[PDB]
Amino acid sequence: GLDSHELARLHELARHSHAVITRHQDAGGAYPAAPTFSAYRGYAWLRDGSFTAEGISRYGDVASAGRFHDWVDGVLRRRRGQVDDLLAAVDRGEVPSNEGMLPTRFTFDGNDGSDPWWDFQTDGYGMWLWSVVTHAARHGLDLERWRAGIDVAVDYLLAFWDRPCYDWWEEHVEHRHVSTLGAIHGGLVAVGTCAALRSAPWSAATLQVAARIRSLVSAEGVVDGHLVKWLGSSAVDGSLPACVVPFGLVPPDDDVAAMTRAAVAKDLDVDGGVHRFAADVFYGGGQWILLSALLGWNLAAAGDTAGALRHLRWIADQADADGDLPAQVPHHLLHPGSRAEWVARWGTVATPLLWSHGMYLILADELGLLP
Numbered sequence: 001g002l003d004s005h006e007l008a009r010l011h012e013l014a015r016h017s018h019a020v021i022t023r024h025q026d027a028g029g030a031y032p033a034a035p036t037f038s039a040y041r042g043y044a045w046l047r048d049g050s051f052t053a054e055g056i057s058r059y060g061d062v063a064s065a066g067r068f069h070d071w072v073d074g075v076l077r078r079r080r081g082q083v084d085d086l087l088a089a090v091d092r093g094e095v096p097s098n099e100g101m102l103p104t105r106f107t108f109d110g111n112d113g114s115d116p117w118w119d120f121q122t123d124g125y126g127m128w129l130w131s132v133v134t135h136a137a138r139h140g141l142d143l144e145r146w147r148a149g150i151d152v153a154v155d156y157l158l159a160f161w162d163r164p165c166y167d168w169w170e171e172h173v174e175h176r177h178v179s180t181l182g183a184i185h186g187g188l189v190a191v192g193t194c195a196a197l198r199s200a201p202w203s204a205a206t207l208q209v210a211a212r213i214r215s216l217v218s219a220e221g222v223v224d225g226h227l228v229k230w231l232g233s234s235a236v237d238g239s240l241p242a243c244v245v246p247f248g249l250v251p252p253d254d255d256v257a258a259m260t261r262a263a264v265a266k267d268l269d270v271d272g273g274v275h276r277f278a279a280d281v282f283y284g285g286g287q288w289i290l291l292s293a294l295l296g297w298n299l300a301a302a303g304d305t306a307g308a309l310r311h312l313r314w315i316a317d318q319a320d321a322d323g324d325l326p327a328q329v330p331h332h333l334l335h336p337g338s339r340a341e342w343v344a345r346w347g348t349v350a351t352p353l354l355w356s357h358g359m360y361l362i363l364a365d366e367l368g369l370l371p
């Protein structure tokens with residue numbers, strides 16, 4: 001579905017995506033989120049990093065992806081005691097506050113980069129489980145390399161999956177977000193269906209909890225045939241297609257999958273650029289590369305190759321003169337009056353965003369375009 005002009009440009013953007021991710025990877029293995037964006041400099045997120053790692057793994061850079069997994073594993077093994085203490089607190093009937101939970105931002109040396117009172121999130125731990133299992137399966141690797149870190153993440157998620165937390169967008173701590181539940185589900189199903197992990201003590205529990213997640217989403221996370229942004233809402237969010245591919249709450253051909261893709265397209269997709277959610281005021285609520293990629297990936301998986309390609313083309317059109325992809329662009333803004341204050345406070349939008357490049361690589365690979 002691409003002519004020679006397009007193929008050459010998409011291949012170049014794929015090469016550049018690999019280069020900019022691997023050039024910015026820290027010496028210790030972490031992928032930074034946004035190396036030139038002042039507010040985020042020096043920090044890694046498991047969400048951004050896991051999708052970045054999946055793009056890199058698909059591209060075939062086994063060494064780079066493995067160094068990311070090494071970094072995450074080591075960071076998590078260092079939290080074995082913190083997690084054990086949280087679990088012991090629960091067993092005494094003393095549920096830990098958000099302030100005591102595992103962090104969202106990490107420094108490259110594995111310390112808390114932010115205070116979880118202000119940004120407590122569980123999705124990234126689920127994403128990491130999905131990512132490391134998927135990588136190991138793809139490349140025929142022994143998961144024992146990363147198993148003790150996997151164990152920490154699994155124990156944590158089995159205890160805390162059903163807690164309210166901030167969403168992927170670091171908002172609304174009181175709610176339970178369907179793409180957060182979806183990320184956890186994806187990670188738990190990945191480990192619970194992995195033959196190499198068949199004897200883990202938590203093996204059965206992971207699939208039972210994944211079923212509990214699906215029960216909760218069925219009860220409170222579906223309205224008018226589509227997934228919704230958080231349990232008990234009516235709105236959609238551009239992250240919701242992740243609950244189809246890759247996280248697997250429903251197959252790509254399920255009616256809920258189709259309806260969710262359609263609702264996201266109708267409510268949030270403007271000319272191929274997907275907004276996060278209707279109420280979004282961050283930088284005025286622009287169009288996010290990673291969300292267009294996510295929708296494209298989902299369209300490809302459902303057999304809508306043309307729709308996938310349209311989103312791939314839109315993403316490529318957002319690359320700057322160096323090939324770098326921003327987090328978002330302002331061609332359409334949901335709340336334009338809100339934009340200038342974000343720019344005054346934090347500067348211009350993060351570019352490159354490694355996750356943008358990682359998602360580009362995933363979609364390109366889905367469409368058979370990795371050179």
Ligand SMILES: OC[C@H]1O[C@@H](O)[C@H](O)[C@@H](O)[C@@H]1O
Pocket residue numbers: 033034040045047048168169170353355
């Ligand atoms: O890139 C780091 C973080 O930036 C935030 O603005 C986004 O809402 C998160 O989804 C992302 O993980």
